[PDB]
UniProtKB/Swiss-Prot annotation, chain A:
Protein role: ATP-dependent serine protease that mediates the selective degradation of misfolded, unassembled or oxidatively damaged polypeptides as well as certain short-lived regulatory proteins in the mitochondrial matrix. Endogenous substrates include mitochondrial steroidogenic acute regulatory (StAR) protein, DELE1, helicase Twinkle (TWNK) and the large ribosomal subunit protein MRPL32/bL32m. MRPL32/bL32m is protected from degradation by LONP1 when it is bound to a nucleic acid (RNA), but TWNK is not. May also have a chaperone function in the assembly of inner membrane protein complexes.
Tissue: Duodenum, heart, lung and liver, but not thymus.
Descriptive protein name: Lon protease homolog, mitochondrial
Subunit relationships: Homohexamer. Organized in a ring with a central cavity. The ATP-binding and proteolytic domains (AP-domain) form a hexameric chamber, while the N-terminal domain is arranged as a trimer of dimers. DNA and RNA binding is stimulated by substrate and inhibited by ATP binding. Interacts with TWNK and mitochondrial DNA polymerase subunit POLG.
Parent-record interval covered: 123 to 153 of 959
Subcellular location: Mitochondrion matrix
UniProtKB/Swiss-Prot annotation, chain B:
Full-protein residues shown: 278 to 339 of 959
Protein name: Lon protease homolog, mitochondrial
UniProt family annotation: Belongs to the peptidase S16 family.
Record-annotated membrane-spanning stretches: none
Domain notes: The Lon N-terminal domains are crucial for the overall structure of the protein, maintaining it in a conformation allowing its proper functioning. The AP-domain (ATP-binding and proteolytic domains) has a closed-ring conformation in the presence of AMP-PNP and its N-terminal entry gate appears closed. Upon ADP binding, it switches to a lock-washer conformation and its N-terminal gate opens.
Amino acid sequence: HLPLIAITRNPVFPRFIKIIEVKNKKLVELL
Amino acid sequence: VVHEDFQVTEEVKALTAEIVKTIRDIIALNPLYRESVLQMMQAGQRVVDNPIYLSDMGAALT
């Protein structure tokens, strides 16, 4: 029951650590 | 300003990987400027609207 995150061209392969940095700030409210 | 290109933009972008890797090698072995700018403009982020400008910026370091 959560909104969809903004991928912003940040693929996440299975069993692989990745870093997502979205320019938006609204997501910080969700965090 | 002529920007003619081929329709199949599938393998033409491959050379961009080699160009950026060469730029990385130059900056690592020959540090002239701060490396933050390269992180800011990442090819994977897709924000590169005009690859000609990125190529010029990379060559500008030469």
